[PDB]
Amino acid sequence: MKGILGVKVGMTRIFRDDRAVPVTVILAGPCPVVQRRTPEKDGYTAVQLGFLPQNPKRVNRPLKGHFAKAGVEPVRILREIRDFNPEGDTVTVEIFKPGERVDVTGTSKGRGFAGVMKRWNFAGGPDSHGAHKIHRHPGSIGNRKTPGRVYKGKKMAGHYGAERVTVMNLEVVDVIPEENLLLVKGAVPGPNGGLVIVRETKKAA
């Protein structure tokens, strides 16, 4: 029921314990509280967090510099963490000692048009024997004159990549609050240089 923003840093292997660890590190960044959300006036429960302060002339207009507390804008907008309500402060990492697995929600790298082969993982055919014609084709679809049609959501030759992906449950290896680091078990969607948020997971009760 917790959360904080961040950005993708490394992926390495810290020789913690005596076991190597593929470790995504995430610069969680000092993401300030701002325009809060209640269910009386909005209809849910969330908090707005802007990422990294880099904003002057090129920001312009409203600002929640207005809000009541300012801070201008980050450099790349703010996001809403559901079920969240701090206590009137800015937040970075400290709210998570190690031992606290969390889901990590981030954007995903884009593969443009994906061939059906490298999307839903198909065979394509034989490396000779038959015809070189198909070779890497999605085979056939539905039956003859009945169905009579094709299936809405049939695994097909289309797009794959520029998507939103939430990964689930990873041991928070350690927290560096002296800067802005949050190192957990390696995974995390997207490039080594794109936005990614942290949210507390669901396991026991």
Partner 1 sequence: MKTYVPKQVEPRWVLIDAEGKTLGRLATKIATLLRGKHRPDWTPNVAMGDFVVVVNADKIRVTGKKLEQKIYTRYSGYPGGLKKIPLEKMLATHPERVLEHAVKGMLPKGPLGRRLFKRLKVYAGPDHPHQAQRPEKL
Partner RNA sequence: CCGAGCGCGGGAACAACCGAGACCGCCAGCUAAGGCCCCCAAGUCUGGGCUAAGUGGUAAAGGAUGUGGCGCCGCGAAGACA
Partner RNA sequence: GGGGAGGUUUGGCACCUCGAUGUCGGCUCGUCGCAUCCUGGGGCUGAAGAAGGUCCCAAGGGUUGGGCUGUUCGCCCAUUAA
Partner RNA sequence: CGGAAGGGAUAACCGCUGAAAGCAUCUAAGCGGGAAGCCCGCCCCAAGAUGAGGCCUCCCACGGCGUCAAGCCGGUAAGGAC
Q: Cα 148–135–116 angle (5° rounding)?
A: 60
Residue type present at position 159? H
Q: Is 205 in the site for RNA (CB under 7 A)?
A: yes
**118 versus 151: smaller Cβ distance to partner 1:** 151
Q: Extract the tokens encoding 16.
A: 């913690």
**CB count, 10 Å around CB of 97?**
10
Q: Is 94 in the site for RNA (CB under 7 A)?
A: no
- Residue 63 binds which entry of partner 1, RNA, none, CB below 5-8 Å type-dependent: RNA
Q: Is 170 in the site for RNA (CB under 7 A)?
A: yes
- Give the end-to-end CA distance of the chain in Å, rounded to a whole number: 12
- Residue 12 binds which entry of partner 1, RNA, none, CB below 5-8 Å type-dependent: none
Q: Is 153 in the site for partner 1 (CB under 8 A)?
A: yes
What's the length of the chain?
205
Q: Is 113 in the site for partner 1 (CB under 8 A)?
A: no
Q: Is 163 in the site for RNA (CB under 7 A)?
A: yes
Going by C-alpha positions, the residue among 82, 203, 193, 196 that lies closest to residue 184 is 196
**139 versus 177: smaller Cβ distance to RNA:** 139
List interacting residues with partner 1 (CB under 8 A).
151-153
